[model samples]
Target: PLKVYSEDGKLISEFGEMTPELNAPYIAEMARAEMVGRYGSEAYTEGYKVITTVRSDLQNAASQSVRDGLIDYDQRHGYRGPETRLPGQTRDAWLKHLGQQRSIGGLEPAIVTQVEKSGIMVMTRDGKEEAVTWDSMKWARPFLSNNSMGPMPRQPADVAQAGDQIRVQRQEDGTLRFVQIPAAQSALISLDPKDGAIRSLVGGFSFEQSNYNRAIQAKRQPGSSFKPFIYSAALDNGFTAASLVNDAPIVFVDEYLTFLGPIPLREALYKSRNMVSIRVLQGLGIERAISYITKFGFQRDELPRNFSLALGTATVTPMEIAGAWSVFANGGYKVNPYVIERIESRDGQVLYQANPPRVPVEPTPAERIIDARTAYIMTSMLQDVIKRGTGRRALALKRTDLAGKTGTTNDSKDGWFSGYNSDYVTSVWVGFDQPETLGRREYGGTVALPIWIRYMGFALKDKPMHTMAEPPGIVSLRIDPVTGRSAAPGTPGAYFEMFKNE
Candidate 1:
């Protein structure tokens, strides 16, 4: 019989004298260093599982969604939005607002633009929407750039064009010589649904190449994506699964602003309407609604005020969005977002392993925050998003078991698709780094969804499908979406149903 022992001769496994723990730390370190060299150093980390938040199945689905959305944008819009330039005064103004908002414990709503090839475009102003042009832009495929631990030059000190010369250019306006440009930036983050582990993170585009991962680090307005939390809060407030919500166009004529719209929570979420989401938020109240998101670990930098929060003016990282949705996938328990699952020493000594993921905040008592029933309702509604809503292309996957949401800003500058399947939850955002046009036809379902589809397929393959669990507050029913009525099992329009989560 082979027995594995620790350095002190304590049994841990059964591999005889050649087991790992008994190996010297130097030996392990050498092995790790060698492995790092082979994997380009960036890929090798100590004892980490090399776990990626991306589910193989889910990642594929996500990538597919992004590709499909781009194609759809071209086909429908006839042209991509205008190319965007680096920050001008408008962008500076927006950043100024962001800085001010951050300083005052406020987060101005992000101005997101959905473009053709770009997924989500974020502008500098709120309600400062504009159409996009094709001239001031460049596009690049997004992915995780492997990292190497170290520092690089602050600036390119040397270049060769027969030896570089620093020349001061004179503008037509006769200003000084140097150009101070704000660099372009973007980010990406992926999270594990089973546990709140962040599997892949590109903090920004590659500075060696692109230089921004706005998706992970950018505190942009989630646009319609924010509706999920608002709706989730609604579920917590005793809204039932069988409850009927209106989906008609609505108008809210208020003294400050005439915000009007029609659509129940389900449709409001689907349509990404401002009025309906506001109404839902109003129904939930400012205190409770804010409490819900804050509990979900939204950035402390941004706060949802009154009903306006439903429009997604609050700031959050895509990482935060994925983390919040994990509650539904994890059966109503919020999980902490983490990038590294464990760390080990060269000798295979377990240095660290994240356990019992943190739920950062709990808006109410766990019992009161959101019941399983409400979570089910929310999931069920999201399923519609895939079946026949803006995210219809996702139907290509034939995943009747999946559920999620889509978001588009008013001016088509930002496109976002956030969703989840049985075993995973994910979100994709696309747009110019600057708030420029992608095109008239771009939207979350069309742009971000392709990435969602591709990534989902890659991440979730072979993983068990952890579909929404039915809770006490929900009702299971057979209903025909076409006829809008209860249907028998054999009826063509019949679909099994359950509902809510927040």
Candidate 2:
């Protein structure tokens, strides 16, 4: 075999910087893009192997988690009826159109050809004929509103007709069923807190249909998921874990109307007490509050200046959300996420090798984002989220080491679950790209948390319960709830709490 040439039969040898490149729609997607940035598009056609930090098993589970969630969430909203109508196309034209249509999120776009007495016959994306029986599709009541669906279909005519463009899926049992492209999209991202190595990520239902990777690309409202930062900020300030904040809104907060007041910081965070979060932010002052949040890898511009920032009006990507949660998981340091572990030439020359910053190591680029005491206490407080709060569904894993926060925005446009343990940090978001209501009942708990739970179950498998021990400079004492001072044993409402050493 003879050697190849770039052009003009000239011998060439060139290379670029071999330092770590930061980036993830996925390992390959992100790594390829990173390689393009460093070495240009020639890295692809030239044949280079870009290995990543991802674990294949975790990535598979993460994909299935989001896939199952999108389909189930789609069904809950009822069908939106046909995608479009070809009107009066011939059978041949229908077949051609079906071949042209895309299959997305395990759904095959189809054209209704015959509304038979028992069910409907359709041509799928492969130009293959399939039947969607009445029993399979009757659950698709008429599209009424996000909060409602119309009467059940009496016949195939009521659901669809000839020339109607629809979607279908083959169930596990190998039977065809009517389905629709989900209007809502979701993202999942998981990273090792110790090193900022991205382990798993699913950017949407399918990368084939939409190349836009929601995990790293979509900027969204974090909603109540932003609460943990506020509490962490308070811990660094004058507030202790037992410090009480009012829950009743002084102004409109949209999600809460309460007689509830004077709850401990842990209670407020675990319960996701919206008004309490606002109260703490108000106490922190807007300028100081922004200052505190930015320390956790959030840019100042991405954070809202107004009080609504307490309600998570700030823009953050799912990957960015995982980065912030990593601060807590990794004992207070901030680490940048990178995907490309190594890049080698076709001949196996190691062209680029990643040296991503990691935590608890001798001096490096990863610096302290918060006090070790604050991080440790915050982790403990968030654990209460799963123990007895909004993320309680995670209890199915039966692990006391889990901790996280659930987030739901006003109008139910966004659902977020931000969570982590000593080992991994993960974030999930669910919403429409156009930002419409998910539904009356589809909060973060109902949508994103299920996906988080499913993925984390696999992620944490066989991994020992990893709990961060209390860091130095932390002091514990029983405080009288009423006086906010030392209390005797068994004093009413007396709480043992942790505080940063003054």
Candidate 3:
């Protein structure tokens, strides 16, 4: 039986006993979603692609490594976990702590506590009270020992607890090989570039630890990973891949007081440059450039104006960022990222099928986010990143054709890596929900790369590496990577490995 309580601690009603028929399916759905977020609306379907973009082999590896990495990070850094009062807290103990601050005048300490559905409890000292089973505010103190919320009535142990056991098996060999155990609040999303299908998704850190899926819901600054759009915009607006943008130091006078120094485009995209984007905005005109970004599906809903728009002050979702970069992989065709391949009702009736893959948005002619040829150039350029830049680990990955961007915030609070193979695009981000330092200089390469690498390696195992071909309207050249200049055959330039062929 479950009892409902009001804000005032009064009883509301009891949801008595449940039978296997009513509860089994509900539990199964939660268990499945915890494994894969809402990527697939229906869990038991043949050939369903919830995270149509990820390489399954890589995903499994990345997941295990990240979980272990976090545990190690916590232990080494002395992060004993979130601050909390001693376990099994007493009401008087809580009140005494509250009494210390009573000396301040007119500060009657309004403490509020609530009982959530999980049978867990919270309490505040100054009288704001709530219990999950009820409707409104309560005047009385609601203590944990006296709370009645849930056992939520379990089914037979063997049957109902089946989903409770999830394990990550690693190499039987004596190596340190591992499979990441996801966190309670973490999530991973992968999609197919060939038709916007979901390939694989691991939503939530762990079902027992947390049921929240951070992939879709968590919004954060994409950091430098966003430079691809600026590059795409530059190409669309009459700038060739060989065209240059000044990457020198510049100061922006604003509330944020941004200062970007000596940042080049590839460095901006690869090393996650700051100054290069500002230079592109300066040349392209902020207003017009933002219009191009909006047209390219960077942020479809918000209208960006000409206000030093390259500083990355915008907030974006994971899928939005994935969709934006996918244009490069899909020959400039904008694909809306999605996971609901289809949905079926309890009676085995097909209830819904995702709309057939079609272009929801495309970069207009004026903005030219990328001419087919230029888009190919950008894709080719990203390939170099996997071969030698921030995403170099991806070069060694089983999927040899993967490329994308790396992003990290100013204070080390957010870490991001968004990339794509010929068939899929996947994004991985790491950090605390509340803005706080993650520790030392946590760059996208170190923090987010392992996650991306491991997942793609797993998700794409046995799947052939995709080959991204040059698009029709673009041209390729062998230039010195260092100077971004034409070089003699085999003259080592900035990223000196190839020579002149423009």
Local distance difference test, per candidate? Answer: 0.51, 0.81, 0.51
lDDT by residue (107-151, candidate 1, tens digit) is 123332334332233443333433222222212111111111123
Best by lDDT: 2
Model 2 TM-score is 0.88
lDDT tens digits by residue: candidate 3, 1-502: 2222221222222232222211111122333453245334333333221211233343445445455445433322321111233434455665565555331111123222323333212333443332221211111111112112223222222111111111112225522211123221234566665455545454444433444456656667787777777776766665545555556667567675333443345445555556677677677887777777875566644434644356565677666677677777777665666544444343546544556445333322222334566566677667767776788767767556778877778776777788887767887777776676565655677667777777677666677877566544333456655456665687765332211133
**Descending-TM-score candidate ranking:** 2, 3, 1
Error of 2 at 8 (Å): 39
lDDT of 3 at 282: 75
* Candidate number that wins on lDDT, 1 or 2: 2
Candidate 3 TM-score to native: 0.61
Which candidate gets the maximum TM-score versus the true structure? Answer: 2
> How well does each candidate superpose onto the true structure, as a TM-score?
0.58, 0.88, 0.61
Ranking 1 against 3 by TM-score, winner: 3
**Number of backbone-clashing residue pairs for each candidate, in the order shown:** 110, 0, 56
Query: For residues 284-357, could you state the per-residue lDDT of candidate 2 as single tens digits?
Result: 88889889888788899999888888778999999888988999998999888867666677897988667777
